[PDB]
Design a binder for this molecule. Structure first.
Ligand SMILES: CCOc1ccc(S(=O)(=O)O)c2ccccc12
Ligand SMILES: CCOc1ccc(S(=O)(=O)O)c2ccccc12
Ligand SMILES: [Ca+2]
Ligand SMILES: [Ca+2]
Lengths: 206, 206
């Protein structure tokens, strides 16, 4: 009857919840491994499942945020990507905003990732010859470490796209620090229902 | 190590297999219920999961075919949709081709659905004033019941878009016969892992 349709819709929301956790775990692994194409396909799958979910728990929203964060980080050098309704916000600025919104511990790693994203948000503009855009990214991002802030401005003004500072704080560094965080998310999600049940099936055939 | 990555990829294929069965079941229910928007969102989810699957069992391929069939049937009046690399194949012709490919029993219902799709493949062209396209659909579809074939041609030639024959064999009739088939697919898939586990969770909270 009508209650059977409600029970079906509830079961659908439970399965969508399990699918979201599995797809996050898969997306995190793909990011960690540098499996570009798998990340792209899993991102499409995760977005599709999320559009079929109406009520989100606090943990599911954090999970969605992490997926959006890693997507924006991966698209960090793609200045043609628009991740926000405001067309001016670059992908690394968008990632920084989500990083500042996640309900997570503000540990040392957190601040290192944050500072690395800020530096690289400017650097990727410099590297594309977008000098006026680097200044605008700078003003939106920056209260903050004055010495740090000043150095960047100098570099922007000097228009030295290839400056040594960005080597000490390279995109790679930003990626490796983010991958260490992804490793901790993976430990927490490797125990979710779908992955756990799929792993037991694989282990029973060995 | 490298075998852990292989075990992870295997577990991913197992979970993708379970997700495909659940999404088919969800798509079938949405079609049966006339839940247009849910069908659209679930279709996006099912397509995304399928792009992340490499090895398909015979049963998974039949499942994919049913999803593609119901999608083309739902888009039957959308003559702007191109479902095949050949731009001339209308959605109902595309659905008819998949219907002729499914590894399923050729029972009475099967042939009724098939004949109803053939009639409606012509009717939806007539209804749009696409008289030359109805003739071309006719020649591609039609060996076949000569009386049946002849009547259609007469109607096409008479250009009577609104002809009584199509009432006796309406799009609705085609939809209701297809919904009876969907009801049998639902019984077969309501027992799959994801739906079964999600239903037990919902039932334990009652
Ligand atoms: C609410 C739908 O979900 C998403 C929307 C947008 C993006 S993004 O624009 O590509 O960042 C996602 C990226 C990953 C996972 C889910 C996403
Ligand atoms: C192989 C990817 O999967 C699909 C591809 C295309 C369509 S369709 O064009 O919309 O028919 C699907 C429709 C439903 C389910 C999966 C589909
Ligand atoms: Ca841009
Ligand atoms: Ca057309």
């Amino acid at each position: 009857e009508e209650e059977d349709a409600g029970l079906v819709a509830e079961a659908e929301a439970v399965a969508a919840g399990w699918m979201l956790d599995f797809l996050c775990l898969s997306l995190c692994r793909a990011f960690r491994d540098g499996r570009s194409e798998d990340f792209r396909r899993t991102r499409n799958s995760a977005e599709a499942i999320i559009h079929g979910l109406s009520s989100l728990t606090a943990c599911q929203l954090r999970t969605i945020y992490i997926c959006q964060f890693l997507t924006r980080i991966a698209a960090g050098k793609t200045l043609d990507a628009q991740f926000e309704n405001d067309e001016r916000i670059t992908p690394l600025e968008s990632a920084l905003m989500i990083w500042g919104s996640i309900e997570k511990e503000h540990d040392k790693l957190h601040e290192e990732i944050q500072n690395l994203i800020k530096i690289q948000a400017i650097a990727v503009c410099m590297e594309n010859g977008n000098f006026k855009e680097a200044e605008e990214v700078f003003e939106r991002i920056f209260n903050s470490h004055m010495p740090f802030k000043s150095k960047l401005l100098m570099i922007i003004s000097q228009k030295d796209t290839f400056h040594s500072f960005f080597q000490h704080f390279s995109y790679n560094h930003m990626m490796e620090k983010i991958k260490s965080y992804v490793n901790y998310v993976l430990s927490e999600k490797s125990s979710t229902f779908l992955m756990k049940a799929a792993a037991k099936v694989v282990e029973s055939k060995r």
